[PDB]
């Protein structure tokens, strides 16, 4: 019998290369434009992943678009945290196999704070020693953790999917531990981590918003990512979006 966790493993996309162009002025602007080009391709990969995610296609198309537009930065930063954990134990930002950034190069203008914020996400994977299956279940829950205050068009379907993957997270925890003493404690810690992602990514999103709107910074964005931000940004800045939290705020 096939399991949901085994399917999450098989649909996880391969890591993308940047195609980086080390033969140029390592300016802050060019690095940010390079990262956004990689980010746009990673979002395309994440859309294809969501289409294959068991249950996601049952949502109204408009809800599928809302969830991807609202959560894309959480997905990208969480996966960056995982790669940086597995490839460098949280010491370097492992954007792609050909684009590994150590924190000396984060001294570039506008780069220090955002790199510290990305490293903090990776440091949580190190602290908790997150397993691959726990990571895969948590990543689905991030896709399902930011919603309009006024609700979704297929609310009942959404409620069912979200509860399904909360249960799957519990199953991944039970598998990680040939015993029982820590199952609830572990679920508590990982749902605390999920809740904390909203704030841990908030500064990254605000910085992205500013580089998108402030054209004099000359940061370039690829086409589909620009479309996504242009829809997400007004909703976030207007306060019309809410996080789904497991614990009292």
């Amino acid at each position: 019998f096939p399991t949901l966790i085994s399917l999450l493993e098989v649909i996880e996309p391969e890591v993308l290369y940047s195609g980086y162009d080390s033969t140029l002025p390592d300016t802050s602007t060019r690095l940010m434009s390079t990262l956004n080009r990689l980010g746009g391709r990673q979002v395309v990969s994440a859309v294809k992943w969501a289409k294959a995610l068991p249950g996601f296609r049952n949502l109204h198309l408009d809800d599928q678009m809302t969830l991807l537009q609202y959560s894309w930065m959480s997905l990208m930063a969480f996966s960056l945290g995982w790669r940086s954990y597995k490839q460098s134990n949280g010491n370097m930002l492992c954007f792609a196999p050909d684009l590994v950034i150590n924190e000396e190069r984060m001294q570039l203008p506008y780069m220090y704070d955002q790199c510290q914020q990305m490293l903090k996400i990776s440091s949580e994977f190190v602290r908790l020693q997150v397993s691959y299956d726990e990571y895969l279940c948590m990543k689905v829950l991030l896709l399902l953790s930011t919603v309009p205050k006024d609700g979704l068009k297929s609310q009942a379907v959404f409620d069912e999917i979200r509860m399904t993957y909360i249960k799957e997270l519990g199953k991944a925890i039970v598998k990680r531990e040939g015993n029982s003493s820590q199952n609830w404690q572990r679920f508590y810690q990982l749902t605390k981590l999920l809740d904390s992602m909203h704030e841990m990514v908030g500064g990254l999103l605000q910085f992205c918003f500013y580089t998108f709107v402030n054209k004099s910074l000359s940061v370039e964005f690829p086409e589909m990512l620009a479309e996504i931000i242009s829809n997400q940004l007004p909703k976030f800045k207007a306060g019309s979006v809410k996080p789904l939290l497991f614990h009292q705020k």
């Binding site: 294809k48 198309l61 678009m65 991807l68 589909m224």
Partner: peptide, 12 residues
């Protein structure tokens, strides 16, 4: 006809 909508409706 946004790019995201097109991708969600596309086959692959």
């Amino acid at each position: 006809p946004s790019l995201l909508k097109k991708l969600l409706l596309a086959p692959a």
